[PDB]
């Protein structure tokens, strides 16, 4: 419990070694705090790319849900973490995962105008067509927070 | 009731009142969009108070008292859409957590 804890605090606070020595001594990888993070969330959302790669290979979940139905995918993309982004389809993140008003990790890519993540979550299939618990696509989205370029490359699909 | 309560229990009610009440919301009633200068609980209280006997968002001002106890006018639809946006961009960016 109290492992777990201080787990959760080392992934959202970018310390690697606090974290490797909390998983060597059996702190559990798929803790949760009050609102359903896990320290595969903070540590997307907070850009610690070491510390998503060891939760990983520890056997993080890769499509857990926090309150709000974030995945660390969306975390990850809502945050502008490319790298991120591109380890957590490595290790099996549903590109399509929907959060509590339908949005998925690329109407969140599309919101901030990131292209770079755009693109790679439209390599590993992400779904131009989904709408949003509010009628949108990810290109509404994008027009929506004037990324012009961003809408056009998504309307051509 | 905790942080985390108050938020879950708040969010929760925007996304019912976005899914399953028909706009527009109060009558047509119009209303301040939210401060952004001012802590968000407050700020949401502010923006709806003078809107009375509205039964569509009477959990959310009931709710939003219990959380605050001391640009343009828009509908309140979008008022209840661009709140609980705002609150799960707040959680996004690492406020609450």
């Known amino acids: 419990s109290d492992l777990d804890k201080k787990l959760l605090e080392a992934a959202r606070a970018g310390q690697d070694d606090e974290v490797r020595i909390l998983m060597a001594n059996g702190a559990d990888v798929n803790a949760r705090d009050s609102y359903g993070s896990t320290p595969l969330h903070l540590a997307a959302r907070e850009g610690h790319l070491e510390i998503v790669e060891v939760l990983l290979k520890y056997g993080a979940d890769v499509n857990a849900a926090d309150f709000i139905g974030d995945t660390p995918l969306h975390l990850a993309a809502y945050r502008g973490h490319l790298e991120i982004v591109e380890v957590l389809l490595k290790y099996g993140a549903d590109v399509n995962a929907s959060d509590i008003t339908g949005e998925t990790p690329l109407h969140l890519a599309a919101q901030i105008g990131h292209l770079e993540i755009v693109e790679v979550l439209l390599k590993h299939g992400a779904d131009v067509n989904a709408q949003d618990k509010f009628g949108k696509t990810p290109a509404d989205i994008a027009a929506d927070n004037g990324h012009e370029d961003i809408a056009e490359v998504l309307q051509k699909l | ?97």
């Not at chain 2, 108070?49 to 106890?69: D, H, W």
């Open chain 2, 1 to 97: 009731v905790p942080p985390s309560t108050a938020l879950k229990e708040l969010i929760e009610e925007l996304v019912n009142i976005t899914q399953n009440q028909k706009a527009p919301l109060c009558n047509g009633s119009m209303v301040w969009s939210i401060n952004l200068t001012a802590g968000v609980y407050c700020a949401a209280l502010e923006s709806l108070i003078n809107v009375s006997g509205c039964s569509a968002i009477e959990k959310t001002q009931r709710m939003l008292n219990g959380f605050c106890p001391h640009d343009t006018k828009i509908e309140v639809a979008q008022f209840v859409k661009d709140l609980l946006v705002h609150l799960k961009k707040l959680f996004r960016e690492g406020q609450f957590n």
